[PDB]
Amino acid sequence: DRELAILATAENLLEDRPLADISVDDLAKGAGISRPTFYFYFPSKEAVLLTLLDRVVNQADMALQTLAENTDRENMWRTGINVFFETFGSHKAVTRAGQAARATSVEVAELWSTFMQKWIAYTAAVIDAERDRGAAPRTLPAHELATALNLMNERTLFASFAGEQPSVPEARVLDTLVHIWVTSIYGE
Amino acid sequence: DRELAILATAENLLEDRPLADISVDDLAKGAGISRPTFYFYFPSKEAVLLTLLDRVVNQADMALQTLAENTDRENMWRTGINVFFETFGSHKAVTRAGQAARATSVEVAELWSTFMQKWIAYTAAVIDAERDRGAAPRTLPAHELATALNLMNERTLFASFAGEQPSVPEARVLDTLVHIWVTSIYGE
Ligand SMILES: COc1cccc(OCC(=O)Nc2ccc(-c3nc4ccccc4s3)cc2)c1
Ligand SMILES: COc1cccc(OCC(=O)Nc2ccc(-c3nc4ccccc4s3)cc2)c1
Ligand SMILES: [N+]
Numbered sequence: 215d216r217e218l219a220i221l222a223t224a225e226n227l228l229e230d231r232p233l234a235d236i237s238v239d240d241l242a243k244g245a246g247i248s249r250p251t252f253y254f255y256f257p258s259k260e261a262v263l264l265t266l267l268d269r270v271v272n273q274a275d276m277a278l279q280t281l282a283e284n285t286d287r288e289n290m291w292r293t294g295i296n297v298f299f300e301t302f303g304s305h306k307a308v309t310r311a312g313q314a315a316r317a318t319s320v321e322v323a324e325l326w327s328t329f330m331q332k333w334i335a336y337t338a339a340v341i342d343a344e345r346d347r348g349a350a351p352r353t354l355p356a357h358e359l360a361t362a363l364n365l366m367n368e369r370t371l372f373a374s375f376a377g378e379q380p381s382v383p384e385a386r387v388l389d390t391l392v393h394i395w396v397t398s399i400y401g402e
Numbered sequence: 403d404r405e406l407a408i409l410a411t412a413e414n415l416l417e418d419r420p421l422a423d424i425s426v427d428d429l430a431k432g433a434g435i436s437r438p439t440f441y442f443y444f445p446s447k448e449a450v451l452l453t454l455l456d457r458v459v460n461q462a463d464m465a466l467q468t469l470a471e472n473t474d475r476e477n478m479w480r481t482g483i484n485v486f487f488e489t490f491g492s493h494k495a496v497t498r499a500g501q502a503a504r505a506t507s508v509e510v511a512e513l514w515s516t517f518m519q520k521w522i523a524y525t526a527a528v529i530d531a532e533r534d535r536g537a538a539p540r541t542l543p544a545h546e547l548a549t550a551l552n553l554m555n556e557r558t559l560f561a562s563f564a565g566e567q568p569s570v571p572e573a574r575v576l577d578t579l580v581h582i583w584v585t586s587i588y589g590e
């Protein structure tokens with residue numbers, strides 16, 4: 215919880231500016247500790263972002279697990295995509311920074327990669343179940359369809375949350391993604 | 403065409419390694435010229451990448467214009483998405499580097515942004531035409547559906563071309579994207 219202070223301060227500062235405009239001394243100051251005391255909890259400012267990102271991706275992941283262990287088909291996909299929209303949506307600054315650091319950082323890249331593989335494998339399993347019960351047609355291989363849908367969400371939510379041009383406005387992005395998932399999963 | 407030599411050399415070196423592992427002296431050497439002679443044609447190695455990216459995006463754009471000024475609906479979308487797949491697919495190293503430099507470079511960011519807005523506006527116009535002729539249903543706003551489909555293609559092609567994990571294998575990515583465009587455009 216000097217640790218938690220450092221994490222909270224880094225998330226607050228990331229609202230204002232990028233990681234590379236945040237100094238260790240910045241983080242230390244905000245957390246009420248000295249610089250060498252900072253280095254006791256974290257090896258670097260990049261390690262702090264990694265930890266923040268790790269907690270955010272694990273929060274989406276635990277929320278999706280919760281949903282899984284339990285409405286119409288459209289509403290089912292909408293409630294699952296909404297886990298990602300609300301979770302990353304509630305941590306935009308960390309989302310944007312972890313987005314950027316995937317270039318910068320092999321560790322940020324592998325964390326992102328492991329969780330995307332997990333969410334894709336879970337989307338493919340649900341598509342397969344829908345196909346085994348006769349509710350969805352056997353069109354594309356489920357895992358390939360899942361990979362594209364998941365990558366679409368990653369890129370489109372990142373764009374909306376960053377205010378990119380072009381982007382879907384944040385107020386319309388959930389409905390946009392759900393329409394594309396549902397038509398592509400159930401459509402022939 | 404000392405200019406063209408510098409452009410060709412930079413595209414060849416980008417096959418081996420990132421821009422930040424390529425030196426001006428590298429580019430100059432490959433192009434058969436001195437360093438100050440290099441600085442006569444380009445202000446920096448970043449300006450060379452910008453130019454390479456500019457020619458690649460304009461090539462996709464002119465190819466899509468060609469198609470536009472002229473088969474079943476599935477095949478129509480497939481031939482248009484294929485412009486992007488073949489054009490960026492034929493220039494992977496430049497594609498990957500321009501992908502990365504969007505973070506690094508406001509100019510790379512604006513070039514990418516201008517062309518994505520243009521391709522989205524064109525996809526929305528064709529969707530609207532399909533809806534005006536009664537061939538597609540009026541579901542999502544055409545421009546929002548176009549923005550998500552185009553962002554999906556950008557992210558999914560970049561992943562396939564980079565060999566990312568996760569990605570759709572390059573041999574399956576065109577069919578994957580076309581299925582999602584067609585079901586989402588024509589589906590209710
Ligand atoms: C920055 O934004 C990002 C970054 C990375 C991923 C992302 O979206 C993934 C996603 O929405 N995938 C997804 C959505 C829903 C489901 C599921 N929803 C349900 C609902 C009921 C039962 C099983 C499931 S499985 C699975 C994966 C968004
Ligand atoms: C690195 O990979 C990238 C990077 C950026 C964009 C991208 O894909 C955009 C795309 O496929 N959009 C697209 C596809 C097709 C069409 C069209 N296809 C036809 C076909 C006939 C008539 C009109 C049209 S309009 C419009 C936009 C791929
Ligand atoms: N949100």
Ligand SMILES: [N+]
Pocket residue numbers: 487488491492
């Ligand atoms: N290609």
